[PDB]
Design an enzyme around this catalytic site. Structure first.
Site, PDB file in Angstrom:
ATOM      1  N   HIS A  63       2.840  -4.366  -3.174  1.00 16.34           N
ATOM      2  CA  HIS A  63       1.914  -4.919  -4.121  1.00 16.34           C
ATOM      3  C   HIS A  63       0.699  -5.425  -3.350  1.00 16.34           C
ATOM      4  O   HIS A  63       0.879  -5.946  -2.248  1.00 16.34           O
ATOM      5  CB  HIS A  63       2.547  -6.072  -4.935  1.00 16.34           C
ATOM      6  N   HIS A  87       8.195  -0.240  -1.495  1.00 16.55           N
ATOM      7  CA  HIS A  87       6.864  -0.169  -2.075  1.00 16.55           C
ATOM      8  C   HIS A  87       6.109  -1.460  -1.729  1.00 16.55           C
ATOM      9  O   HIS A  87       6.689  -2.383  -1.185  1.00 16.55           O
ATOM     10  CB  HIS A  87       6.898  -0.001  -3.581  1.00 16.55           C
ATOM     11  N   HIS A 146       2.271   2.471 -10.991  1.00 19.47           N
ATOM     12  CA  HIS A 146       2.343   1.009 -10.810  1.00 19.47           C
ATOM     13  C   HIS A 146       2.211   0.654  -9.319  1.00 19.47           C
ATOM     14  O   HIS A 146       1.670  -0.427  -9.016  1.00 19.47           O
ATOM     15  CB  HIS A 146       3.681   0.467 -11.331  1.00 19.47           C
ATOM     16  N   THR A 165       8.600  -6.404 -11.964  1.00 18.36           N
ATOM     17  CA  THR A 165       7.973  -5.568 -12.983  1.00 18.36           C
ATOM     18  C   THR A 165       8.975  -5.372 -14.102  1.00 18.36           C
ATOM     19  O   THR A 165      10.175  -5.501 -13.862  1.00 18.36           O
ATOM     20  CB  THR A 165       7.581  -4.169 -12.470  1.00 18.36           C
ATOM     21  N   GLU A 196       2.942 -11.272  -4.280  1.00 18.97           N
ATOM     22  CA  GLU A 196       3.657 -11.749  -5.461  1.00 18.97           C
ATOM     23  C   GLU A 196       4.191 -13.141  -5.185  1.00 18.97           C
ATOM     24  O   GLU A 196       3.804 -14.134  -5.834  1.00 18.97           O
ATOM     25  CB  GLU A 196       4.732 -10.746  -5.855  1.00 18.97           C
ATOM     26  N   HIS A 208       8.143  -4.681  -0.399  1.00 22.59           N
ATOM     27  CA  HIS A 208       9.481  -4.834  -0.960  1.00 22.59           C
ATOM     28  C   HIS A 208      10.373  -3.676  -0.556  1.00 22.59           C
ATOM     29  O   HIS A 208      10.125  -2.538  -0.946  1.00 22.59           O
ATOM     30  CB  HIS A 208       9.395  -4.877  -2.491  1.00 22.59           C
TER      31      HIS A 208
HETATM   32  C1  LIG Z   1      15.426   1.629 -13.761  1.00 22.05           C
HETATM   33  C2  LIG Z   1      14.951   0.304 -13.248  1.00 22.05           C
HETATM   34  O1  LIG Z   1      15.316  -0.776 -13.745  1.00 22.05           O
HETATM   35  N1  LIG Z   1      14.089   0.342 -12.231  1.00 22.05           N
HETATM   36  C3  LIG Z   1      13.551  -0.861 -11.600  1.00 22.05           C
HETATM   37  C4  LIG Z   1      12.642  -0.494 -10.408  1.00 22.05           C
HETATM   38  C5  LIG Z   1      12.189  -1.718  -9.663  1.00 22.05           C
HETATM   39  C6  LIG Z   1      12.632  -1.977  -8.383  1.00 22.05           C
HETATM   40  C7  LIG Z   1      12.159  -3.059  -7.628  1.00 22.05           C
HETATM   41  C8  LIG Z   1      11.187  -3.909  -8.219  1.00 22.05           C
HETATM   42  S1  LIG Z   1      10.586  -5.306  -7.276  1.00 22.05           S
HETATM   43  N2  LIG Z   1       8.993  -5.316  -7.344  1.00 22.05           N
HETATM   44  O2  LIG Z   1      11.164  -6.489  -7.937  1.00 22.05           O
HETATM   45  O3  LIG Z   1      10.967  -5.071  -5.891  1.00 22.05           O
HETATM   46  C9  LIG Z   1      10.703  -3.663  -9.496  1.00 22.05           C
HETATM   47  C10 LIG Z   1      11.210  -2.564 -10.194  1.00 22.05           C
HETATM   48 ZN   LIG Z   2       7.959  -4.968  -5.788  1.00 21.14          ZN
END
Ligand SMILES: CC(=O)NCCc1ccc(S(N)(=O)=O)cc1
Ligand SMILES: [Zn+2]
Ligand SMILES: CC(=O)NCCc1ccc(S(N)(=O)=O)cc1
Ligand SMILES: [Cl-]
EC number: 4.2.1.1
Length: 259
Positions: free
Chosen positions: A95, A93, A63, A198, A105, A118
């Site tokens: 996007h 990470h 992803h 996500t 996002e 993020h």
């Molecule tokens: C086990 C579990 O719920 N993992 C979630 C991982 C997860 C962490 C951060 C994000 S974001 N893009 O909102 O920063 C999405 C998914």
């Molecule tokens: Zn993210």
């Protein structure tokens, strides 16, 4: 099994069928209307304390890619601003888009940036990340926009290792990386209550989105776009456009730390 993604057949418009909270009351990301956001004098100073951050590994999870940290002690924490208590850095990470004109996002007065970073943190009062994501104040995600211009020197070690994690499930050692090299000068931010962007889309996040973007070079983001969503030996699907579009604001206010 999980089969969500970013394609026409499994992308954001399909997520609600397996993750019904996708249509919830505090989903992310959102458009940040800069004229409607209100300055909040109640916000305490934001404290980003990454001096002792200990990176370990970088992982292509199909992803995005995550730079993972040792979160077994308070080595890298976020505090202050809207936050009550101490939030520990677990991973960062990005996007990003297929083209420089999309990829973020969050949007700012409907403007899409080329990418969005993020930095993910969990509230230490809940002991571990797994428990934190079941709490309404379990996570704090620091979001930083990327625009294409000058190179970001602090990003280049990330871009250099991507060759080695092209496909889903690959990882590489990634020690001694300083995430402070990914921040802009100013810590001026917007904040609001939201969700993971996500699946599982859990409504556990205090979002802190910096106003100042960082600049990365075209060549740096072009390397992001050479990653693959697929695993090794499978039909190549470039890892591009791994962003969720803005979701309804519903009964929320976005607060500004500045002006
Ligand atoms: C086990 C579990 O719920 N993992 C979630 C991982 C997860 C962490 C951060 C994000 S974001 N893009 O909102 O920063 C999405 C998914
Ligand atoms: Zn993210
Ligand atoms: C791989 C693929 O495209 N599968 C199509 C079926 C499929 C589409 C969407 C989802 S969801 N609601 O989790 O986003 C699961 C399965
Ligand atoms: Cl939750």
């Amino acid at each position: 099994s999980h089969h969500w993604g970013y394609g026409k057949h499994n992308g954001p418009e399909h997520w609600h069928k397996d993750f019904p909270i996708a249509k919830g009351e505090r989903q992310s990301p959102v458009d940040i209307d800069t004229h409607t956001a209100k300055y909040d004098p109640s916000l305490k100073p934001l404290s980003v304390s990454y001096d002792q951050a200990t990176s370990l590994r970088i992982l292509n999870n199909g992803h995005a890619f995550n730079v993972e940290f040792d979160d077994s002690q308070d080595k890298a924490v976020l505090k202050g601003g809207p936050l009550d208590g101490t939030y520990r850095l677990i991973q960062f990470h990005f996007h990003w888009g297929s083209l420089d004109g999309q990829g973020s996002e969050h949007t700012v007065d409907k403007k899409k940036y080329a990418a969005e970073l993020h930095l993910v943190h969990w509230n230490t009062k809940y002991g571990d990340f797994g428990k934190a994501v079941q709490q309404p104040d379990g996570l704090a995600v620091l979001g930083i926009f990327l625009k294409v211009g000058s190179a970001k020197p602090g990003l280049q070690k990330v871009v250099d290792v991507l060759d080695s994690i092209k496909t889903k499930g690959k990882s590489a050692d990634f020690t001694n990386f300083d995430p402070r090299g990914l921040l802009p000068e100013s810590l001026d931010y917007w904040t609001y209550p939201g969700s993971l962007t996500t699946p599982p889309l859990l409504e556990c996040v205090t979002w802190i989105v910096l106003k100042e973007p960082i600049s990365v070079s075209s060549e740096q983001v072009l390397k992001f776009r050479k990653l693959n969503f697929n695993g090794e030996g499978e039909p190549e699907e470039l890892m591009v456009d791994n962003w969720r579009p803005a979701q309804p604001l519903k009964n929320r206010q976005i607060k500004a730390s500045f002006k």
